[PDB]
């Protein structure tokens, strides 16, 4: 494409000099106390995903896209994190979530416990629990908040309040009778019972809070949207009954109410907008379901009232599902939505007393390449045909997954199908039903006070040990000691 303005060396020299001047002025370190901490988390957002999301965001506004900047690319400090588990070489969701939320690496499939426990065994989790950064923040007088686009009792958010030996125990319906006999409790019970004064909770998973065979308010005729609890306890009713009678609790469940509320008269909020996982960004309903940006804005406005500060945990957790199913368009669109939410949240707060950290838990086997020309659509074909079987191939490819297609001995001719659709699955090397994770290191972006302590290549469990250092919470209180 080669725009005219880029044909002069002076343009690049001036750009580099301006970048140098900014980086030289940045030498003044910020040694304030992080009054507020915000942690953005993208499930399965490696480096290739970030680059593809940047290109897509640029091209959505009729640009080549390569030169554009994401809202997380303006974060001054960048580091790399190793994501291996104690038990596994390729990471998982629960173990990594424990690593970067509690500060201690653990096995796979176990939430909120150390590495001395064994998966799916109740009588080995006693005395091996670990407390997450949410508990440290709440014990210091700060507010706590959880915003997710997935279930509130999914692995990534539940690693902050739950101590369970299995991540598949969503409710007592999924727990085997042996675990019930030995006294274990499902994740929803711990969500409503472990920390009894969590201010803002937002996400899906509305069918794990109701007794069995209870019709849903939103979907009347859907048989999969009914309740699943075998106790007979209404968990939302319990949640409304654990708070002082002179305060306000709402339990909104759609977008009209979320827009109607004013944060100046709300103290506790519980939003369950979907029976299970919230819908994709491209499949979302405008009228009845809110986006991540609106939920983040309302949560920030509610939590901003505390003079001691707040700790907000935001998850863009549909990237992992979009990659697992094998569709790249969806996952890139939730990456773009996550970036928009980051920008909206950063607009409200001030960088002088707020530590913002964007991170990921692992990466996938997503790849893109093939000598594509400048300005080429990221979902388009490669410029040259294959030189072995004489067929076109797309730029986006997967190491494995359900995209592996072979029609009678030869791979699929891409020109016969609509590769620009919303539900198109790119071709892969080995056929599977779900594309696996990846062992690559992940990138951690950070800005705010004491954000320069994330510099080199380090372990994952180092992330929650520096934030607690900046806010004078946890076990190390030497930042603001005399």
């Amino acid at each position: 494409l080669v725009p005219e303005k880029e044909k002069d060396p002076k343009y690049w020299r001036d750009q580099a000099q301006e970048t140098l001047k900014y980086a030289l002025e940045l030498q003044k370190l910020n040694t304030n106390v992080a009054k507020n901490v915000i942690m953005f988390l993208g499930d399965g957002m490696g480096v290739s995903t970030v680059t593809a999301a940047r290109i897509l965001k640029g091209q959505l506004h009729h640009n080549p896209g390569e030169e554009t900047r994401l809202e997380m690319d303006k974060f001054p400090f960048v580091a790399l994190s190793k994501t291996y588990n104690t038990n596994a070489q390729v990471p998982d969701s629960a173990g990594t979530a424990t690593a970067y939320l509690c500060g201690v690496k653990a096995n796979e499939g176990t939430v909120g416990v150390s590495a001395a426990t064994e998966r799916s065994r109740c009588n080995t989790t006693q005395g091996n629990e670990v407390t997450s950064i949410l508990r440290w923040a709440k014990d210091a007088g700060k507010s706590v908040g959880i915003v997710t686009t997935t279930r509130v009792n999914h692995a990534t958010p539940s690693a902050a309040y739950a101590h369970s030996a299995d991540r598949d125990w969503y409710s007592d319906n999924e727990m085997p009778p042996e675990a019930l006999s030995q006294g274990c409790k499902d994740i929803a019970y711990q969500l409503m019972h472990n920390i009894r004064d969590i201010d803002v909770i937002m996400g899906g998973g509305r069918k794990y809070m109701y007794p069995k065979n209870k019709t849903d308010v939103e979907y009347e005729s859907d048989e999969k949207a009914r309740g699943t609890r075998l106790d007979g306890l209404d968990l939302v009713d319990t949640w409304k009954s654990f708070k002082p009678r002179y305060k306000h609790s709402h339990f909104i469940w759609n977008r009209t109410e979320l827009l109607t509320l004013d944060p100046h008269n709300v103290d506790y909020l519980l939003g369950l907008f979907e029976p299970g996982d919230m819908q994709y960004e491209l499949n979302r309903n405008n009228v009845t379901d809110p986006s991540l940006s609106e939920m983040v804005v309302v949560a920030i406005q509610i939590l901003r009232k505390n003079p001691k500060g707040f700790f907000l945990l935001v998850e863009g957790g549909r990237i992992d599902h979009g990659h697992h199913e094998g569709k790249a368009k969806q996952a890139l669109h939730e990456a773009v939505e996550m970036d928009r939410a980051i920008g909206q949240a950063g607009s409200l707060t001030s960088s002088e007393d707020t530590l913002t950290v964007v991170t990921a838990d692992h990466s996938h086997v997503f790849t893109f390449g093939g000598y594509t020309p400048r300005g080429n659509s990221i979902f388009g074909l490669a410029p040259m045909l294959s030189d072995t079987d004489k067929k076109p191939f797309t730029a986006i490819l997967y190491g494995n997954g359900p995209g592996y297609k072979v029609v009678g001995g030869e791979r699929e001719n891409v020109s016969m199908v609509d590769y620009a659709h919303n539900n198109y699955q790119a071709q892969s090397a080995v056929p599977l039903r779900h594309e696996t994770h990846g062992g690559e290191d992940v990138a951690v972006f950070s800005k705010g006070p004491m954000a320069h302590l994330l510099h080199g290549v380090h372990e994952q469990n180092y992330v929650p040990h520096v934030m607690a250092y900046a806010a004078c919470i946890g076990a190390n209180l030497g930042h603001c000691a005399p």
Partner: single-chain antibody, 225 residues
Framework: QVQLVQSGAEVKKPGASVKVSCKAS????????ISWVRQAPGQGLEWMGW????????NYAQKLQGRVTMTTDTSTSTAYMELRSLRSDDTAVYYC??????????????WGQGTLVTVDIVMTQSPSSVSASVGDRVTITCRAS??????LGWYQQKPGKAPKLLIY???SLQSGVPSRFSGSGSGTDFTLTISSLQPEDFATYFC?????????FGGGTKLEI
């Protein structure tokens, strides 16, 4: 440090009003509210209301409504409480207390010196009076008429002194208190345990709930020697 100072003793006659002032120093005045507590001679603590120093909203007890007014002045950082139509049973010690934080206004952390003036969820405490020797272990039980979750606070009062906060939330130890004291229980029954007893731990203990207005204090357990 944080310190609250009140005026001197005031003697009045029935019908005349009385004003009590409480000046606080050591913190940002508008960030915390002020509660007013009353203690009759020989009886337990009684609650009148509080006032928030940020927006000025006030809450008064139903028993004393129509006679108590509460004002705040952030310019000089003072809180005033005025009472009208004094009766023969209004003689008592009035205390101004400060809450602990944002969502914890049921836990009175810092207390005033107490001004002497001369003219629902029922909380039960057991035993009425317990006697023990030095170095022993004691346990005191507090029961509520309704489920109050984990909203409970334990206070200690030595004779002639203001109450001191020991445990808030029925399981969390206040900073500056020895780890010897322990608190446990939840729902309807709560317990406070002292593993080792010392000569400087003989006083009267109270349990107060922060669930629903009005705030109710316990009857008091006299831990004698």
């Amino acid at each position: 440090q944080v310190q609250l100072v009140q005026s001197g003793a005031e003697v009045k006659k029935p019908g005349a009003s009385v004003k009590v002032s409480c000046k606080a120093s050591g913190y940002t005045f508008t960030s915390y509210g002020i509660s007013w507590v009353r203690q009759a001679p020989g009886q337990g603590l009684e609650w009148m209301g509080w006032i928030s120093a940020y927006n000025g909203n006030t809450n008064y007890a139903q028993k004393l409504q129509g006679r108590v007014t509460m004002t705040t002045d952030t310019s000089t950082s003072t809180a005033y409480m005025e009472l009208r139509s004094l009766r023969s049973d209004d003689t008592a010690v009035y205390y101004c207390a400060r809450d602990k934080g944002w969502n914890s206004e049921g836990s009175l952390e810092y207390w005033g010196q107490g001004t002497l003036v001369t003219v629902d969820i029922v909380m039960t405490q057991s035993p009425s009076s317990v006697s023990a020797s030095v170095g022993d272990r004691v346990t005191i039980t507090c029961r509520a008429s309704q489920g109050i979750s984990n909203w409970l606070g334990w206070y200690q009062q030595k004779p002639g002194k203001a109450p001191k906060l020991l445990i808030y939330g029925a399981s969390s130890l206040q900073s500056g208190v020895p780890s010897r004291f322990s608190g446990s229980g939840s729902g309807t029954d709560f317990t406070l345990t002292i593993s080792s007893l010392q000569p400087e731990d003989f006083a009267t203990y109270f349990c107060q709930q922060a669930y629903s207005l009005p705030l109710t204090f316990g009857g008091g357990t006299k831990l004698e020697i």
